[PDB]
Enzyme design. Structure first.
Site, PDB file in Angstrom:
ATOM      1  N   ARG A  70       0.862  -1.178   0.000  1.00 30.83           N
ATOM      2  CA  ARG A  70       0.000   0.000   0.000  1.00 30.83           C
ATOM      3  C   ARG A  70       0.895   1.224   0.000  1.00 30.83           C
ATOM      4  O   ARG A  70       1.925   1.240   0.680  1.00 30.83           O
ATOM      5  CB  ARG A  70      -0.940   0.065   1.217  1.00 30.83           C
ATOM      6  CG  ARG A  70      -1.855  -1.135   1.417  1.00 30.83           C
ATOM      7  CD  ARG A  70      -2.776  -1.377   0.231  1.00 30.83           C
ATOM      8  NE  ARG A  70      -3.794  -0.347   0.055  1.00 30.83           N
ATOM      9  CZ  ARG A  70      -4.918  -0.280   0.759  1.00 30.83           C
ATOM     10  NH1 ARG A  70      -5.176  -1.138   1.733  1.00 30.83           N
ATOM     11  NH2 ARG A  70      -5.800   0.679   0.485  1.00 30.83           N
ATOM     12  N   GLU A  99      -2.211   8.374  -4.408  1.00 29.35           N
ATOM     13  CA  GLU A  99      -2.314   7.571  -5.607  1.00 29.35           C
ATOM     14  C   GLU A  99      -3.066   8.349  -6.673  1.00 29.35           C
ATOM     15  O   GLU A  99      -3.693   9.378  -6.394  1.00 29.35           O
ATOM     16  CB  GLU A  99      -2.967   6.222  -5.311  1.00 29.35           C
ATOM     17  CG  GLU A  99      -2.469   5.160  -6.308  1.00 29.35           C
ATOM     18  CD  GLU A  99      -2.432   3.751  -5.742  1.00 29.35           C
ATOM     19  OE1 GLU A  99      -1.387   3.351  -5.186  1.00 29.35           O
ATOM     20  OE2 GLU A  99      -3.449   3.042  -5.873  1.00 29.35           O
ATOM     21  N   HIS A 104      -0.038   0.319  -9.991  1.00 33.37           N
ATOM     22  CA  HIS A 104      -0.924  -0.497  -9.160  1.00 33.37           C
ATOM     23  C   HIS A 104      -1.583  -1.603  -9.985  1.00 33.37           C
ATOM     24  O   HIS A 104      -2.812  -1.706 -10.098  1.00 33.37           O
ATOM     25  CB  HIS A 104      -1.951   0.387  -8.446  1.00 33.37           C
ATOM     26  CG  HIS A 104      -2.527  -0.232  -7.213  1.00 33.37           C
ATOM     27  ND1 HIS A 104      -3.083   0.515  -6.194  1.00 33.37           N
ATOM     28  CD2 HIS A 104      -2.633  -1.528  -6.831  1.00 33.37           C
ATOM     29  CE1 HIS A 104      -3.513  -0.297  -5.243  1.00 33.37           C
ATOM     30  NE2 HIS A 104      -3.252  -1.540  -5.604  1.00 33.37           N
TER      31      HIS A 104
HETATM   32  N1  LIG Z   1      -0.341  -3.984  -5.465  1.00 28.11           N
HETATM   33  C1  LIG Z   1      -1.557  -4.802  -5.662  1.00 28.11           C
HETATM   34  O1  LIG Z   1      -2.124  -4.864  -6.715  1.00 28.11           O
HETATM   35  C2  LIG Z   1      -2.045  -5.617  -4.414  1.00 28.11           C
HETATM   36  C3  LIG Z   1      -2.861  -6.717  -4.569  1.00 28.11           C
HETATM   37  C4  LIG Z   1      -3.233  -7.459  -3.457  1.00 28.11           C
HETATM   38  C5  LIG Z   1      -2.791  -7.064  -2.188  1.00 28.11           C
HETATM   39  N2  LIG Z   1      -1.998  -5.951  -2.047  1.00 28.11           N
HETATM   40  C6  LIG Z   1      -1.491  -5.543  -0.699  1.00 28.11           C
HETATM   41  O2  LIG Z   1      -0.436  -6.232  -0.475  1.00 28.11           O
HETATM   42  C7  LIG Z   1      -0.341  -6.428   1.111  1.00 28.11           C
HETATM   43  C8  LIG Z   1      -0.124  -7.905   1.418  1.00 28.11           C
HETATM   44  O3  LIG Z   1      -1.240  -8.638   0.938  1.00 28.11           O
HETATM   45  P1  LIG Z   1      -1.545 -10.062   1.672  1.00 28.11           P
HETATM   46  O4  LIG Z   1      -2.710 -10.716   1.001  1.00 28.11           O
HETATM   47  O5  LIG Z   1      -0.312 -10.957   1.787  1.00 28.11           O
HETATM   48  O6  LIG Z   1      -2.005  -9.609   3.205  1.00 28.11           O
HETATM   49  P2  LIG Z   1      -2.129 -10.563   4.493  1.00 28.11           P
HETATM   50  O7  LIG Z   1      -3.316 -10.013   5.268  1.00 28.11           O
HETATM   51  O8  LIG Z   1      -2.192 -12.029   4.195  1.00 28.11           O
HETATM   52  O9  LIG Z   1      -0.757 -10.365   5.345  1.00 28.11           O
HETATM   53  C9  LIG Z   1      -0.524  -9.065   5.893  1.00 28.11           C
HETATM   54  C10 LIG Z   1       0.557  -9.326   6.971  1.00 28.11           C
HETATM   55  O10 LIG Z   1       1.071  -7.904   7.499  1.00 28.11           O
HETATM   56  C11 LIG Z   1       1.434  -8.165   8.743  1.00 28.11           C
HETATM   57  N3  LIG Z   1       1.495  -6.973   9.577  1.00 28.11           N
HETATM   58  C12 LIG Z   1       0.602  -6.206  10.204  1.00 28.11           C
HETATM   59  N4  LIG Z   1       1.291  -5.249  10.853  1.00 28.11           N
HETATM   60  C13 LIG Z   1       2.610  -5.446  10.630  1.00 28.11           C
HETATM   61  C14 LIG Z   1       3.729  -4.735  11.078  1.00 28.11           C
HETATM   62  N5  LIG Z   1       3.835  -3.541  11.958  1.00 28.11           N
HETATM   63  N6  LIG Z   1       4.953  -5.109  10.719  1.00 28.11           N
HETATM   64  C15 LIG Z   1       5.110  -6.225   9.900  1.00 28.11           C
HETATM   65  N7  LIG Z   1       4.024  -6.919   9.468  1.00 28.11           N
HETATM   66  C16 LIG Z   1       2.759  -6.516   9.834  1.00 28.11           C
HETATM   67  C17 LIG Z   1       0.274  -9.041   9.232  1.00 28.11           C
HETATM   68  O11 LIG Z   1       0.615  -9.738  10.369  1.00 28.11           O
HETATM   69  C18 LIG Z   1       0.045  -9.969   7.996  1.00 28.11           C
HETATM   70  O12 LIG Z   1       0.776 -11.257   8.182  1.00 28.11           O
HETATM   71  C19 LIG Z   1      -1.477  -5.928   1.588  1.00 28.11           C
HETATM   72  O13 LIG Z   1      -1.231  -4.455   1.930  1.00 28.11           O
HETATM   73  C20 LIG Z   1      -2.457  -5.933   0.462  1.00 28.11           C
HETATM   74  O14 LIG Z   1      -3.397  -4.934   0.636  1.00 28.11           O
HETATM   75  C21 LIG Z   1      -1.587  -5.226  -3.159  1.00 28.11           C
END
Ligand SMILES: NC(=O)c1ccc[n+]([C@@H]2O[C@H](COP(=O)([O-])OP(=O)(O)OC[C@H]3O[C@@H](n4cnc5c(N)ncnc54)[C@H](O)[C@@H]3O)[C@@H](O)[C@H]2O)c1
Ligand SMILES: NC(=O)c1ccc[n+]([C@@H]2O[C@H](COP(=O)([O-])OP(=O)(O)OC[C@H]3O[C@@H](n4cnc5c(N)ncnc54)[C@H](O)[C@@H]3O)[C@@H](O)[C@H]2O)c1
Lengths: 329, 329
Positions: free
Chosen positions: A234, A263, A282
């Site tokens: 994000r 964004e 994105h």
């Molecule tokens: N760029 C894109 O097109 C796209 C697509 C899908 C997801 N995303 C983003 O990518 C990220 C990861 O997606 P995901 O499905 O693996 O999410 P997920 O929910 O499976 O995992 C997120 C992890 O972040 C960890 N977290 C929370 N706070 C933290 C902190 N202070 N320090 C370290 N880790 C912490 C959580 O414990 C969790 O394991 C998310 O932000 C999601 O929104 C982006």
């Protein structure tokens, strides 16, 4: 037959086809709050395309509303409290693009190591001899630091270790250390150790109040000057102004970003003026496979709640009993 | 032509087995020995494992055509996941299909302990109605419930005990946000010791991991109030059962209600059978008609998905997917 409002289209028309077998749907394109309000009053279901918003005042106008489905994991632009108070089930659609984002992350890590977009530009300009000043990086035996060992971070860790021969470190306070060990990574309690030890740092956390602007000038100072940042999570996790200062002062060597804050990045964005910067708009989670899977999931859950069936990704299960009272019993 | 699927124990609803029979040939074993599994598993493409039946690494290695293992519910502790991953075998669980059932059963056990319900039913039936003049049932209003593991079931138990009984609810779970507790009226505590000191009832709802294995041992029972009760519907290995018996004998806690055991099934001469204020059930907390149907359909459909090469929703070893691809082609 039930009516469904789509605040933004789905990611694949097959989801709209699923809804149309049993419902009458109306589709709005980035509608204003007023356009939502005059379209929402008689619908039983609502689909919200990220990053559109659904406000409490709009939910209150939907007297027969049963279910709100978002397009991905995110529900931050939904007033869940309002939905809960009215017996409306909110579902998300999480993890539909894990493989796509993991592949995009590998793509950006490799492209940074190989200086790929810069070299392409140089060859196409006749600057083949740039090769004299070039030192592409071998990923094997370098250290990858994963911040956020969730769905995507875990897969990226596994493939960088198994297929690319990297040492993988992880920082995630909210998963057990066993989760890292299963895929060959080491979970570290102190983020500063990961920052000092990593040649590539890739961000995969959820956006929370704790991770907002977590990657700022203090963090970049701790990173190796030779290291690279990758952000596919994000835009708000990174302080872009600090990132520019860090590149300008050679606190890190480069970065690859798929997400930005604000964004749509501005035409002015100073990050554009570094050739150790690689940008994508994105798109990390956008593949035909991921779009279809999310569209089908969202439609199927709307249809489940309209039938009275519990959907798999309820965000507010505390609302079910009131939902029962309003629409069953 | 059809793929073969082995059921190591039946599903709890025949609907799952009928779904499988549409496209595969099935064999159903009843509490088989390791040898009976090895004989029946050699040519199968998919395996269903009814908890607590075990599927060990040696058996998985004999299953040369195995593609997918499905558990009956959330828990995977009877599966050697590492062996499956090494062999390109996808493991799916079936989570969240019994959440209301277990929450209801947990509330049932909390109330039955407070009201001494099984003991008093025995008293009246044996002619000792006049025991009433020595009984002091507990009023649950404003007593403290401590939840260990604020997941699907733990969060619903916290919600129901607040709404139904007026109990103060504390929770311990290092891996969820404090906001999750606040939404159902509970407080998330960073120190388990505080929860143990303050709770009148402690109810276990964690995943079984190396961190929670034997978490509830004699040191923990010494911290609990002598007047307090333990409830366990999660996994038997979270509790050190020998220490629990010691704790009951030594009056470190007042009683307990258990739906899961270590040794599961428990032995004929388990010492817990002889204690006061013990209430036992045979791993039925999540077994209602509604839950059994949902779990059976989910298990069958995921097995069929993997047999078709389709990615299922509840893969517990997603790092194995590429090796599954390599074998499945
Ligand atoms: N760029 C894109 O097109 C796209 C697509 C899908 C997801 N995303 C983003 O990518 C990220 C990861 O997606 P995901 O499905 O693996 O999410 P997920 O929910 O499976 O995992 C997120 C992890 O972040 C960890 N977290 C929370 N706070 C933290 C902190 N202070 N320090 C370290 N880790 C912490 C959580 O414990 C969790 O394991 C998310 O932000 C999601 O929104 C982006
Ligand atoms: N019939 C039955 O008795 C029955 C039926 C269904 C599920 N279960 C069991 O109940 C348990 C909970 O099921 P669920 O669907 O709610 O799982 P869940 O994954 O939704 O919740 C488990 C929670 O345990 C927490 N956890 C992990 N480590 C912890 C630790 N060291 N300390 C405190 N909490 C920790 C996790 O963070 C998670 O929030 C599981 O053990 C499951 O096997 C039993």
């Amino acid at each position: 037959k039930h009516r469904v409002l789509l605040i933004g289209k789905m990611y694949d028309e097959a989801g709209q086809k699923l809804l149309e077998e049993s419902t009458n749907t109306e589709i709005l394109s980035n509608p204003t709050l007023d356009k939502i309000n005059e379209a929402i009053q008689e619908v039983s279901g609502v689909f919200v395309r990220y990053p559109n918003k659904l406000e409490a005042s709009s939910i209150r106008l939907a007297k027969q509303l049963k279910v709100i489905s978002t397009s991905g994991f995110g529900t931050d632009s939904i007033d869940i409290m309002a939905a809960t108070e009215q017996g409306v089930i909110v579902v998300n659609n999480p993890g539909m693009s894990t493989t796509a984002v993991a592949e995009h992350t590998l793509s950006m890590i490799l492209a940074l190591a190989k200086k790929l977009p810069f070299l392409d530009h140089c060859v196409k300009k006749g600057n083949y001899l740039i090769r004299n000043q070039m030192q592409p990086i071998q990923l094997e035996n370098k250290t990858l630091g994963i911040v956020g060992l969730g769905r995507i971070g875990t897969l990226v860790a596994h493939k960088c270790n198994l297929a690319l021969g990297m040492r993988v470190l992880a920082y995630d306070p909210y998963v057990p250390a066993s989760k890292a060990e299963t895929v060959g990574a080491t979970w570290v309690k102190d983020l500063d150790v990961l920052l000092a030890e990593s040649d590539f740092v890739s961000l995969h956390t959820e956006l929370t109040s704790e991770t907002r602007e977590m990657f700022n000038i203090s963090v970049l100072k701790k990173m190796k000057p030779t290291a690279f940042l990758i952000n596919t999570s994000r835009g708000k996790v990174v302080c872009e102004k600090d990132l520019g200062i860090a590149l300008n002062q050679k606190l890190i060597a480069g970065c690859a970003l798929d997400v930005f804050e604000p964004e749509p990045p501005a035409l002015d964005n100073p990050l554009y003026n570094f050739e150790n910067v690689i940008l994508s708009p994105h798109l990390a989670g956008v593949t035909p496979e991921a779009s279809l899977a999310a569209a089908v999931s969202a439609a199927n859950q709307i249809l489940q709640v309209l039938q009275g069936e519990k959907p798999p990704y309820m965000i507010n299960p505390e609302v079910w009993n009131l939902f029962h009272h309003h629409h069953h019993h």
